[PDB]
Structures are given as structure tokens and as C-alpha cells.
């Protein structure tokens, strides 16, 4: 199940100021960027053009090139038409299709001031249940534009799935790539008196799915709290798993790492081991300004 998304970020400071930046993700790999400082959509991968020829790309780029300018002015006129709502204004757009055979569900979500309010469904734009009522009038206006509504329908029903099926094969090499995680141990005072928070750092692994647990032999320590996936510049991932122990309970515990790149043979970092000791000695510091 691969999810492809085009993310548009449009800001309006006033009547005379606006910028639009775009980014494009397949799974968790960035394929395209489009800065407000540039009249051309940029490839961030050697395979970002998909299975589309030069002529097919230039026509689609120009299609969007026309859209970026138009969108800006269309919004600015809607503001004047609602002049009820004032500047500054933030608009976000999320659009694309999910892959499953030939089946694919397409979407186009719109948020106004950081809250989801509009989506394109079937043949027209619609307001979300529990949305501002003043949004009806602009929606009524946007629907009277058959050409834009036809273009969107084309892009959602036909273009997205035919293009994304092209990318998935074009970048099969980078998607199936395997990167080995590296782990190192740490500890910090728990927020509770007499307690200690152990930390298992796990960095550099690709793809994303990973398993990290604290173990006493054959028993996974149920107090193991899995962290949030933090990105690295080389599109790999960092994650930490933490365990709260009473001072003294450190010994005999281990951090176990399961990742597809390791291929059976896990990483087992034991607390207090000669390796753990050697890693920690290479890490000492004056502790300013440690976290409160």
C-alpha cells in the first residue's frame, strides 16, 4: 500500500503579498519540489519523471504553471468577494492517490487557516460536514468553472494512477533499498524520584518499519515506550525506545532491534557490557545545558 501525495502551501500576507511552495511524496520519499522562487518543478530523484516522456512532462508542468498564477489571483478575488474574512490567510492542499491490482482511491483535500474545510468529490468541490457557512458562496463560484472541474477530474481519475504506477516501477531500486540500523545506549534521570530513564538510540535504518524493545532475556519489558520516527537528511530514520527503571534494575536488560535489512540476525545491546562501557566513555560531557 503506497500513498502518493502532492502538498501545496499557499500563504497570503495581504492584498499585495503571496507565495506558493509545493512538495511531492511517494511513500516517505520526496520526488518533487516546487519553490515560489522557481518557474519550473524540480526533480529530487533521478527517476522523478516516472514513465512519462519529455513531451508528456512539459505539458503537465505547463498545466500546473498556469494553475499556480491563477490560483493566487482566484483566491485574492474571493477574499474581495467576502469583504467577513481578513488577511493573513493560509491555504493548504493535499492531493493524490493510494495504490492497492488496478484499483486506486484518489483524493483532494483543502484546509483554510489550518483546518480542513473543502474537498473535491466526483464532479465538483464540496464543503466538509461541520464547516463555516460563508464558504458556500465561494464553493458555488468555483463549481461554475467547468474547465477547472474537468481538469481536476482528469488528474484524479486518470493521471494520478497512470503516473504513480509509472513511478513505482521507475524507482523500484530506491524503494527496495535496505539500510542497516545502528544502536547505542544512554540514560537520563526519570521525572520520578529514585528512577532512571534508559534510552535506546536507533539511527540510519531504511525502510521505515522497525521493531525496538527492551528485554530481560525472553520477556519484552512492557514499559517499553516507542518513540516518534525522526527523519535524517539521507532519508533514513532515527527512533529511540525508552524504559523507566528503578535505580539498580539497569543490569541484565538489553535493547533488541528487528529490521528487514539485518535479515534474521538482530542487534542486542546489553546494559553494562564492555561494549556499552566503551561507547559511554567516548560520549562523556560537562552536562550543560542538559534538559530539565
Amino acid at each position: 500500500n503506497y500513498t502518493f501525495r502532492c502538498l501545496q502551501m499557499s500563504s497570503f500576507a495581504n492584498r499585495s503579498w503571496s507565495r506558493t511552495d509545493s512538495v511531492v511524496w511517494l511513500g516517505d520519499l520526496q520526488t518533487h519540489r516546487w519553490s515560489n522562487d522557481s518557474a519550473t518543478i524540480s526533480f529530487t530523484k533521478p527517476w522523478s519523471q516516472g514513465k512519462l516522456s519529455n513531451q508528456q512532462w512539459e505539458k503537465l508542468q505547463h498545466m500546473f504553471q498556469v494553475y499556480r498564477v491563477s490560483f493566487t489571483r482566484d483566491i485574492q478575488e474571493l477574499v474581495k468577494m467576502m469583504s467577513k474574512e481578513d488577511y493573513p490567510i493560509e491555504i493548504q492542499l493535499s492531493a493524490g492517490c493510494e495504490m492497492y491490482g488496478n484499483a486506486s482511491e484518489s483524493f483532494l483535500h483543502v484546509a483554510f487557516q489550518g483546518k480542513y474545510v473543502v474537498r473535491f468529490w466526483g464532479t465538483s468541490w464540496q464543503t466538509v460536514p461541520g464547516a463555516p457557512s460563508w464558504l458556500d458562496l465561494p464553493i458555488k463560484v468555483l463549481n461554475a468553472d467547468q474547465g477547472t472541474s474537468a481538469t481536476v477530474q482528469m488528474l484524479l481519475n486518470d493521471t494520478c494512477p497512470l503516473f504513480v504506477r509509472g513511478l513505482l516501477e521507475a524507482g523500484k531500486s530506491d524503494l527496495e533499498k535496505q539500510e542497516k540500523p545502528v544502536a547505542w545506549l544512554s540514560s537520563v534521570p526519570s521525572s520520578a524520584h529514585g528512577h532512571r530513564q534508559l534510552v535506546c538510540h536507533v539511527s540510519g535504518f531504511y525502510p521505515k518499519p522497525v521493531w525496538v524493545m527492551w528485554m530481560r532475556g525472553d520477556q519484552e519489558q512492557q514499559g517499553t515506550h516507542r518513540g516518534d520516527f525522526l527523519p535524517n537528511a539521507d532519508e533514513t530514520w532515527y527512533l529511540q525506545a525508552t524504559l523507566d527503571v528503578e535505580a539498580g534494575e539497569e543490569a541484565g536488560l538489553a535493547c533488541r532491534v528487528k529490521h528487514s535489512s539485518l535479515g534474521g540476525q538482530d542487534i542486542i545491546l546489553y546494559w553494562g557490557s564492555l561494549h556499552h562501557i566503551l561507547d559511554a566513555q567516548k560520549m562523556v560531557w560537562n552536562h550543560r545545558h542538559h534538559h530539565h
Epitope: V66, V69, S70, R73, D74, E77, L78, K80, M81, S83, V141, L142, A144, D145, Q146, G147, T148
Partner: T-cell receptor, first 113, second 109 residues
């Protein structure tokens, strides 16, 4: 100007054919309209063109549109005297209430009897 | 039908001139254009409905007012010889835009 027209003014012998040109750079180009302006009066619409390649007709007037050429031609078959007027080419950038019309200087058609 | 009043006007430099427009078409949008040789129609002010009023491409010298769906005025508080032109008033979603008969304004020193 985003919309130009040729010729400046045209002269035709009553009953013959008259050919008027329009060339633009309006982006995007949703539709193109031709107007007629009787001297001392407002603008009356003759015809509108929607498709990328559109061929429209109304009475003596017939018009063509090519969007990839950004060009249009208004034909008057068998001109009358009462056709002596300014003819203006107008392009609408967007097919919604948010659009904005771009006007040309127009051609001044003069029909000699 | 789009009604204009007056059809002709002679004003002096620094005088107050108001061109009144009207339409019984129940139209949301209205526009004020001026027509000068070798140009084609240029937009001065426009509106999306009662209360609202917006600057066009050449608003300098001109103000606008729309109190009702019917009326739309162009107000020249201090008149200039450079404001001598023919003025047209349009209405409709830019779907068909309908135009007025025009007002000849001459402003003299």
C-alpha cells in the same frame, strides 16, 4: 497590449466579403468573444468561442478560433451598409465569475456603397 | 438592458461628476470602463455586490459606490482634462457580460 487586432480599419465594397483578425497572449485563454459597436452606442455581442479549435456561425457572421495559435478570424459574408461599425475582440481569462475580460483596440469597418 | 445617466456631460477642472448606472437583471457583478482611441476598454472600478467596491486597473482620479444590486456609480471628486473620455458600464459573470450605451464626458480648463 495582451490583445491586438488587424487591420486598424477596413474598407469593403457593399456585398463583398470582409476578413478581420485578432491575436492575443492572454493566459489562460478560456473563451473569445466578438462585439459590435455602432457609432455612439454600446457593445453588442455577436458570438462566443469555447473549444480549443472552435468554428461558430450566426447570421452573416462566422468566426474561427485556434487556441494553440492564439488567433481568431471574423468573417462577414456579403456585407451590408448597416454593418459599418467598430468590431472588438475580447478574451476572458477564466470561465467563472472570477475571470477578467481583456479588450482589443478594435477594427473600424467602413462599408462603401 | 443596462441604463446609463447621463449620456453627455460637460464639466470644469476640479468639479464633481457622478455617472449613474442601472440594471434590472439581478446581476452580482458590475464594471466601469473608459474607451480611448488606440487602447480598447480599460477597467477602472468593479463590484461583486451591494456594499463591496474594488479597484480595477486605472482607479486614479475615480471613486466608486454600490448601495444596491441595481445602481453603481463612478465618482470624480476633482475632475481633470485627462478624464475626458467615453464611459461604459457592464454587468455579468465574466455566463455573459452585458454593456451599457456609454457616457461622453468632456472636462475643460
Amino acid at each position: 497590449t495582451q490583445v491586438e487586432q488587424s487591420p486598424q480599419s477596413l474598407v469593403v465594397r457593399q456585398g463583398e466579403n470582409s476578413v478581420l483578425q485578432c491575436n492575443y497572449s492572454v493566459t489562460p485563454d478560456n473563451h473569445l468573444r466578438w462585439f459590435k459597436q455602432d457609432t455612439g452606442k454600446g457593445l453588442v455581442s455577436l458570438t462566443v468561442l469555447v473549444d480549443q479549435k472552435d468554428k461558430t456561425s450566426n447570421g452573416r457572421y462566422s468566426a474561427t478560433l485556434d487556441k494553440d495559435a492564439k488567433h481568431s478570424t471574423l468573417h462577414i459574408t456579403a456585407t451590408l451598409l448597416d454593418d459599418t461599425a467598430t468590431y472588438i475582440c475580447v478574451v476572458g481569462d477564466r470561465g467563472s465569475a472570477l475571470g477578467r475580460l481583456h479588450f482589443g483596440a478594435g477594427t473600424q469597418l467602413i462599408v462603401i456603397p | 438592458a443596462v441604463t446609463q445617466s447621463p449620456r453627455n456631460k460637460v464639466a470644469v477642472t476640479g468639479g464633481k461628476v457622478t455617472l449613474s448606472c442601472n440594471q434590472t437583471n439581478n446581476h452580482n457583478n458590475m464594471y466601469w470602463y473608459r474607451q480611448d482611441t488606440g487602447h480598447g476598454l480599460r477597467l477602472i472600478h468593479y463590484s461583486y455586490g451591494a456594499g463591496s467596491t474594488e479597484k480595477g486597473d486605472i482607479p486614479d482620479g475615480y471613486k466608486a459606490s454600490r448601495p444596491s444590486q441595481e445602481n453603481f456609480s463612478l465618482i470624480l471628486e476633482l475632475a481633470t482634462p485627462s478624464q475626458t473620455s467615453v464611459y461604459f458600464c457592464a454587468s455579468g459573470d465574466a455566463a455573459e457580460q452585458f454593456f451599457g450605451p456609454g457616457t461622453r464626458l468632456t472636462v475643460l480648463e
